[PDB]
Structure 1
Amino acid sequence: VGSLNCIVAVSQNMGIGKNGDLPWPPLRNEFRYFQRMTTTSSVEGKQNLVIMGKKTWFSIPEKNRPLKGRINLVLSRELKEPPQGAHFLSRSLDDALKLTEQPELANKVDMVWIVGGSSVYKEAMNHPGHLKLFVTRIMQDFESDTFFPEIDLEKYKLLPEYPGVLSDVQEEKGIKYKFEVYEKND
């Protein structure tokens, strides 16, 4: 098993969701970036694993479920099996990561990507160890009901560059946004 990573897109007021969707109109290239980053596995013959909360799962439209070419693991304490389309179910982030060091997965999983929501992100970000955050900054306020947790810049350093990640400001349906990569190791 290779890297542990979080990926999020966040508005300026730290908003990531609203009424079970994203706070902003769909940005096609942000979705394409998310796809590319989560799917791409630099260790031939392995797949990436995506870990998400239950609400995040159901927030993805049904025909795009499971996220293709990735092992999909949903986090729930209420569900008794993976939702229709989902591969794995865990009752905690620990168990999910614990589940990756088993026979079934340990030689199949490369990168693990936490793809939301808030409480998964929160727990990951505050877990000791080597962790990157791939943060798309949507450069406006958008009204939101769910938020990205605080990034502690004493521990997380913004990288000045990263391969395969555009540094330049992007714009789509009149909304400016930028890609960032943060790294901690503690």
Structure 2
Amino acid sequence: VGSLNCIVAVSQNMGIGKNGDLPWPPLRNEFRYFQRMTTTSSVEGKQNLVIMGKKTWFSIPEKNRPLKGRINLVLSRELKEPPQGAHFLSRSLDDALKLTEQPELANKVDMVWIVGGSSVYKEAMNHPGHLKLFVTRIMQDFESDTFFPEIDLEKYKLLPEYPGVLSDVQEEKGIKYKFEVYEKND
């Protein structure tokens, strides 16, 4: 693996979570964007790998676990085996990436997508090498108990436009949001 992707939706006050769910009501097209980005693989015969924290895993409805069309990996320092339905378990992002180089996963994984939560994003965003951050800016404040840290512009640059990503402000259920893409190379 020579690149990593993070994907997140964040409120104006840096919120990503509230009481084990999203702080905002469901945005259907925003979710489909999340599906499309994480699921779409450019290589026939391979699937993308999604990496998530334990709480995020259990935030997904049982009937939708594991995430279809993707290899589901859960991070935990406490679990000794993957939770029911999950394909893999690792104690760290580095361990997870290494696992991709093992016989089981060799030639099976295309892109790697980190889908939260907070601590998973923090580790991933400091990981060396090329990294893209797909950040949906929900353009209003929402009550939250889980947050996304401000992006270090010393490392990351906001890309002005991007292929496959809409640039204009979007609106669903009266809520305005915008798709952003950040990138670092080192």
Superimposed CA distance per residue, residues 28-79 of structure 1 (whole angstroms, 9 cap, x where no aligned partner): 0111000000000011211100000000000011111111000000001222
Cross-structure match for 1:147: 147
Q: How far apart are the structure 2 equivalents of 1:2 and 1:173? A: 38
What is the number of equivalent residue pairs in this alignment?
A: 186
Q: CA deviation at 1:3?
A: 3.2
Q: CA deviation at 1:2?
A: 5.4
Superimposed CA distance per residue, residues 137-157 of structure 1 (whole angstroms, 9 cap, x where no aligned partner): 000010111111220112111
Report SS of the residue matched to 1:144: coil
CA-based RMSD: 1.0
Residues 23 and 143 in structure 1, CA contact (< 8 A), matched pair in contact too: yes
Residues 167 and 178 in structure 1, CA contact (< 8 A), matched pair in contact too: yes
Name structure 2 gaps, 5 residues minimum.
none
Cross-structure match for 1:51: 51
Residues 3 and 129 in structure 2, CA contact (< 8 A), matched pair in contact too: no
Q: CA deviation at 1:164?
A: 1.3
Superimposed CA distance per residue, residues 85-138 of structure 1 (whole angstroms, 9 cap, x where no aligned partner): 100011111101111111211211110000000001001111221100000000
Q: Structure 1 residues 30-39 or 99-108, which shifts more?
A: 99-108
Cross-structure match for 2:182: 182
Percent identical among aligned pairs is: 100
Q: Structure 1 residues 152-161 or 108-117, which shifts more?
A: 152-161
Normalised by the length of structure 2, the TM-score is 0.97
Q: CA deviation at 1:18?
A: 0.6
Name structure 1 gaps, 5 residues minimum.
none
Residues 15 and 148 in structure 1, CA contact (< 8 A), matched pair in contact too: yes
Q: How far apart are the structure 2 equivalents of 1:85 and 1:30? A: 25
Residues 6 and 113 in structure 1, CA contact (< 8 A), matched pair in contact too: yes
Residues 4 and 113 in structure 1, CA contact (< 8 A), matched pair in contact too: yes
